Amino acid sequence: ASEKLTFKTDLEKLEREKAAQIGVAIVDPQGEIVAGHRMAQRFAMCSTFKFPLAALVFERIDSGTERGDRKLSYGPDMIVEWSPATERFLASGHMTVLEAAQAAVQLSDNGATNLLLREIGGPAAMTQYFRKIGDSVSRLDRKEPEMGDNTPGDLRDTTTPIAMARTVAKVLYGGALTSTSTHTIERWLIGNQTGDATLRAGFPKDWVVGEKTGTCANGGRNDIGFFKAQERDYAVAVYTTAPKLSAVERDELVASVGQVITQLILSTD
Numbered sequence: 001a002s003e004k005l006t007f008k009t010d011l012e013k014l015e016r017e018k019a020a021q022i023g024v025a026i027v028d029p030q031g032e033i034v035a036g037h038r039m040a041q042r043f044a045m046c047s048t049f050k051f052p053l054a055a056l057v058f059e060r061i062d063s064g065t066e067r068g069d070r071k072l073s074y075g076p077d078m079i080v081e082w083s084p085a086t087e088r089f090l091a092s093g094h095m096t097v098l099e100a101a102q103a104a105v106q107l108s109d110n111g112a113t114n115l116l117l118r119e120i121g122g123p124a125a126m127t128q129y130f131r132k133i134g135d136s137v138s139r140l141d142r143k144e145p146e147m148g149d150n151t152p153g154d155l156r157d158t159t160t161p162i163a164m165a166r167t168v169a170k171v172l173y174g175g176a177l178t179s180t181s182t183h184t185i186e187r188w189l190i191g192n193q194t195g196d197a198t199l200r201a202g203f204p205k206d207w208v209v210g211e212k213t214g215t216c217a218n219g220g221r222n223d224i225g226f227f228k229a230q231e232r233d234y235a236v237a238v239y240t241t242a243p244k245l246s247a248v249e250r251d252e253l254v255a256s257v258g259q260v261i262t263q264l265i266l267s268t269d
Contacts, residue, residue, distance in 0.1 A: 002006040004035055008047040010145035010260045011037045018253055020219075020242035027235050027259060029206030031162045034234065035264050039162040042137075043239030046165065046214025048224045049126065049140055049157075050104040050113050053190065055171045057101050057116060058181035072119060084205035086111030103246040105188045105212060110144035115253045117143050125144050137163035150241075153189035161237045164224055168234035172226050184212055190224055197251040199223040199238055202258020211236075219243035223248035230264050236261065 008039050025041050026034040033039075060066035071094040079087055085103035089095045095103070103109035117123065126140035140147065141156035148157070152198050159167075170176050172186060189210025198221070200209040211225025224237040238257050242250050 003264055006267075007035050007260060007264045008037060010263075011257065013258055014253065014260075017217060018242055018249070018260055019244050020240055020253060022257060023161040023237075023239040024257060024261070025165035025237050026077040026264075027165045027169050027171055027231050029170045029235070031166040031174070031235075032163070033052050036162060039165075040160045041205050042155055042158040042160055043222065043241065044154075044214075044216045044220050045138065045140070045150065045157055045159045045164070046148045046150070046216040046220050046222050047108045047110075048145075048159070048212050048237075048239075049112075049138070049147075050212040051185070051224065052130065052138070052167060052171070052213040053113065053116060053120075054101045054105050054134075054185055054188070055127060055177060056126065057097060058122070058177050058185060059129070061097075062178045062181055066097060066119075068096065068101075070097050071095075072097060072100060074111075074115055078115055078118075080110045080114065083109050083111030085109045086115070096159045096195075099103060105185070106191060106193050108194050108213065114143045118195050125148075130167065133167060135159075135163050135167045135170075138167060148214075148216040148220070150218045150220045152218065159237075159239070161239055164239075165237040166223055168226060168237065171232060172235065176216075186226070192232075193224075195223060197248075198254040199225070199236070199261075200227075201251075202255035202260075203262055207262075208259070212234060214239075215247075217252075219245065219250065221254055223254050229262075230268075232268075234265070 139160040214222035
């Protein structure tokens, strides 16, 4: 209670001084709440949905309705803003399911994400997967990049911190995927290339951390994932809205939230 009050007060200070709204949820591996802030306020998911999308793909691999080495053909029509791996593989004419999923998770590659969405039935099928694993909140309505428009008040392409944190825990800890598929996605999250300056920059350097970032128009900056601290496993979701901050200052904001999280966790002994 005392620690939870410091958590709240310190996030409210960041919110007030950075003119930002901060949504956080921390859950244990079974989805029980450790701490939260605006945890049931809706925020645009931005690229954070690419981690659940990968989980959906591995579920189809686990079930035999997809194969990771299946070649997904495409042309230049699939290149959109921020498609670094898709652009590199374009001349070869395809990416495999697994290549696309790894680029979506680790580089946030939009073309690779849309390639997978083409294959699994689109935003509706992403939403259906959320519902299947117990998430009645998260919804994908659009492909990239327009799903990141983050029009104020729009409930399309949103989640809440608590719903997403519980989805992360379900995927990583609650048996949604085989051990092999779970480990593959865990390692992709640890080796993510886009999160060096966000949440994991605010955590102690010996905590094992893996996460997926998101950036939206109108000041969305998010980071979801998992961390292992003091031999305890957690799932975490951070969504922020800071319209007036610079991109670097939003990075710093999420890292600061990581520090506030750390101080709560360390006050469990």
